[PDB]
Design a binder for this molecule. Structure first.
Ligand code: HEM
Ligand code: HEM
Ligand SMILES: Cc1cc(N)nc2cc(-c3cncc(CN)c3)ccc12
Ligand SMILES: Cc1cc(N)nc2cc(-c3cncc(CN)c3)ccc12
Ligand SMILES: Cc1cc(N)nc2cc(-c3cncc(CN)c3)ccc12
Ligand SMILES: C[C@H](O)[C@H](O)[C@H]1CNc2nc(N)[nH]c(=O)c2N1
Ligand SMILES: [Cl-]
Ligand SMILES: [Cl-]
Ligand SMILES: [Gd]
Ligand SMILES: [Zn+2]
Lengths: 404, 402
């Protein structure tokens, strides 16, 4: 039972929940691998025991264990797998398992919200044009004209036999990235690969820096085909600064809805290779990482030139000064546009309350310190001073090979 | 099977074969990572010794030579006869450099071979100790042009007690509790302040009162020693444009000299071996002044800046903090005292990582400690994956001797 301390206040708690971790992680007594983005590398017999454990926490959370109403559910599952080698989830179980995978996501800082999630059950899906209609229902419901609502849409699980449903884009909204005789990039360098797949699959390229990409959707066994998102379903936010009037002229935008569509939803031993979820942005994700990472839009020196900062010497902290204004512009622009967003202070403070909540509820919370701490002003937030334990619980969102 | 490590800013990939020989074990398991925690007889002393000697004779390009097998047999025979052994001076110098080189939370390690080693292993009393320490401080400070130094005091030995310095650093500011239950000065130092008082220190009542030294000679209670005002170079803090900032009366000192860590070399243990470098400006500006449980000036500066502190989305904290860091860097450069900002520091740590991979095939690095406390992803170490593990020689933490 690891001892975890908060250095700002002095409180101590013990993490008893860690003892129930099973899926072993990357670290050993010899060496710590906590900072690696993708840890390690990306006869059903074992399918039963995973299913059993999940059902036991489902009925643990709700009502009753012991001559209850779920040895019946225990029996139906093992009879289901005995018959067909896989089983189906009750809609409330899929709902509960969806909420738990969010609750167990060590790298997510917004888990104080894990109880409010809209689980669309898309398991009766049959083709790409139908998928695309689920994805569009989600996007409309999530966006909600800027009053954002957490939502996940679960497509049919992996079933031994033939291929699985697959969103080829990493998100539902991604900006194109084009190359030159420079080898430089116009638009988002994170999306240089998928941009040329859309092109090689028929899409006509675009103007440049903020072209929303088409959707590459894949039904089982079929080759993927492109889908164009309706420009009215893709709410974007022009970036302007409250007092730097020239900032709007830089032409920067970002989209409203963060919707990750490449991760794998594992519930009770079932694998859902297509289960896109969405929430709302923390502001530093846009202002600091997306716009200012050297391998992303890399705008930092451009904004410092415009602010007339001393870029000739690092010790003027021009990088720090321009990055703060970029973030102030993000927060300002989303609020003026009435689009849900949350700044890294509000968010980290909420996550501390989540930690105390989870301490009383489950005796701990898995948290990945390096991803909980924001990428600007780390030690200014309380999460910086909070020791944390990182470990894998199921249900879980997990990374997966991309379909190439 | 060696960990694969990527730099995401550039696309680089390397493999950390050096982690494979990590001689001590940490707190992480495959069940759970604890990287974020702050505080994670005969031939076992001989095995660390043989390894260290193997290290030394490898760096002087003389591995497996005449002089090498002799030293092994010397050290072995000495542990049989005395239970311990004595480092030669050249070994001590190399051992102290490796300890810095091996320190996984140090972003200043590009400098690790530029290290001035003072051998005080002949020290006899707390009074001699004091004299050696004033010499260390005088040499490291060097009128504001700081130099890396370490003074090594006698090793832990059977039959005698330890030398210990009770202060966590050579230069620290008093922390007095008070009427409000509040602390005046540095809250991180209330306990050592209470120990100095009850050992005969006449306490002041300011916010930046330099503490006396509590020095322990073996099997003796600690003795108080005052540092001469002129040995402790301080820096008044002002801001290059916010002229009201100098009216906060804030100061910091020049020399960061950590005195409470244990130096370990080939199984031998030195519980007293203070070491000093020069500050990175975030240690002072961000942590020491803005930590809510340290001086905690952030709101008072943000109010003085006429920022809107009612709402977090104005980012008033980030803005006040960045100007505090500016003021720290300005003030140190104005006073001609060495200082490094977190952009220069992290860029040189990247160069250190590239040197280390070519030399030893890797580098122990604690990401959460290497990444600065403000502007993290603005620096290149953010996008560098790292491998944390414990190599000897090393500095370790040790319990407080009270
Ligand atoms: C409600 C507002 C939410 C906020 C503000 C938020 C914020 C964040 C942030 C900042 C990260 C770090 C990602 C990175 O920078 O690499 C993250 C990760 C993550 N989020 Fe949340 N999130 C929210 C909702 C959700 C929802 C609804 C789900 C799923 C149902 C979810 C699941 C995850 C997962 C699995 C990760 C880890 C992703 C990975 O490991 O690659 N989050 N979140
Ligand atoms: C010359 C310039 C140096 C710089 C810029 C520097 C920078 C730093 C920084 C920023 C830290 C982390 C501080 C924190 O915990 O907040 C650190 C830690 C450390 N440094 Fe360096 N340092 C320098 C010199 C040295 C020297 C000369 C030694 C030893 C001979 C050393 C050994 C260590 C150790 C052992 C730690 C970890 C401290 C701990 O575990 O509590 N450093 N350094
Ligand atoms: C639901 C949700 C909300 C939010 N604000 N950010 C997310 C960020 C991710 C995410 C995961 N891996 C990598 C990235 C980009 N480095 C982002 C996934 C889901 C998110
Ligand atoms: C030689 C040296 C130089 C420097 N600039 N900072 C140091 C900082 C420390 C250090 C040790 N324990 C705790 C801290 C702050 N959490 C800092 C130790 C040595 C340092
Ligand atoms: C996770 C983490 C990362 C990091 N780089 N430094 C930490 C420093 C502390 C810390 C250490 N000693 C004293 C204090 C008082 N602020 C705080 C706690 C956690 C930290
Ligand atoms: C190398 C390092 O582990 C990597 O850049 C991580 C660190 N922390 C992060 N934290 C968040 N939220 N998002 C990220 O992409 C990263 N990147
Ligand atoms: Cl994003
Ligand atoms: Cl300090
Ligand atoms: Gd002024
Ligand atoms: Zn670990």
């Amino acid at each position: 039972f690891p001892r975890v301390k908060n250095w700002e206040v002095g409180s101590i708690t013990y993490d008893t929940l860690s003892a129930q971790a099973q899926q072993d992680g990357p670290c050993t007594p010899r060496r710590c691998l906590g900072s690696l983005v993708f840890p390690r590398k990306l006869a059903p017999e074992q399918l039963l025991s995973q299913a059993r454990d999940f059902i036991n926490q489902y009925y643990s959370s709700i009502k009753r264990s012991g001559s209850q109403a779920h040895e019946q559910r225990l029996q139906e599952v093992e009879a289901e797998v005995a018959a067909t080698g896989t089983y189906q989830l009750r809609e409330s179980e899929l709902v509960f398992g969806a909420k738990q995978a969010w609750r167990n996501a060590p790298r997510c800082v917004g888990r104080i919200q894990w109880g409010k999630l809209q689980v669309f059950d898309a398991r009766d899906c049959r083709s790409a044009q139908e998928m695309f209609t689920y994805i569009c229902n989600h996007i409309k419901y999530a966006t909600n004209r800027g009053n954002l609502r957490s939502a996940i849409t679960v497509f049919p699980q992996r079933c031994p036999g033939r291929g699985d449903f697959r969103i080829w884009n990493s998100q539902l909204v991604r900006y194109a990235g084009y190359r030159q005789q420079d080898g430089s990039v116009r638009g988002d360098p994170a999306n240089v690969e998928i941009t040329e797949l859309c092109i090689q699959h028929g899409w006509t390229p675009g103007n440049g820096r903020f072209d929303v990409l088409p959707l590459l959707l894949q039904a089982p066994d079929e080759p993927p085909e492109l889908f164009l998102l309706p420009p009215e379903l893709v709410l974007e936010v022009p970036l302007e600064h409250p007092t730097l009037e020239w900032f709007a002229a830089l032409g920067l935008r970002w989209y409203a809805l963060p919707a990750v569509s490449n991760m794998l939803l594992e519930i009770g031993g079932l694998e859902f290779p297509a289960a896109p979820f969405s929430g709302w942005y923390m502001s530093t994700e846009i202002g600091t990482r997306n716009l200012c990472d050297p391998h992303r839009y890399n705008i930092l020196e451009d904004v410092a030139v415009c602010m007339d900062l001393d870029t000739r010497t690092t010790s003027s902290l021009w990088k720090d000064k321009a990055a703060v204004e970029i973030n102030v512009a993000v927060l300002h622009s989303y609020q003026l546009a009435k689009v849900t967003i949350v700044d890294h202070h509000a968010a980290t403070a909420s996550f501390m309350k989540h930690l105390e909540n989870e301490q009383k509820a489950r005796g701990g919370c898995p948290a990945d310190w390096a991803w909980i701490v924001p990428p600007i002003s780390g030690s200014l937030t309380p999460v910086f001073h909070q020791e944390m334990v990182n470990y894998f619980l199921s249900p879980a969102f997990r990374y997966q090979p991309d379909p190439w």
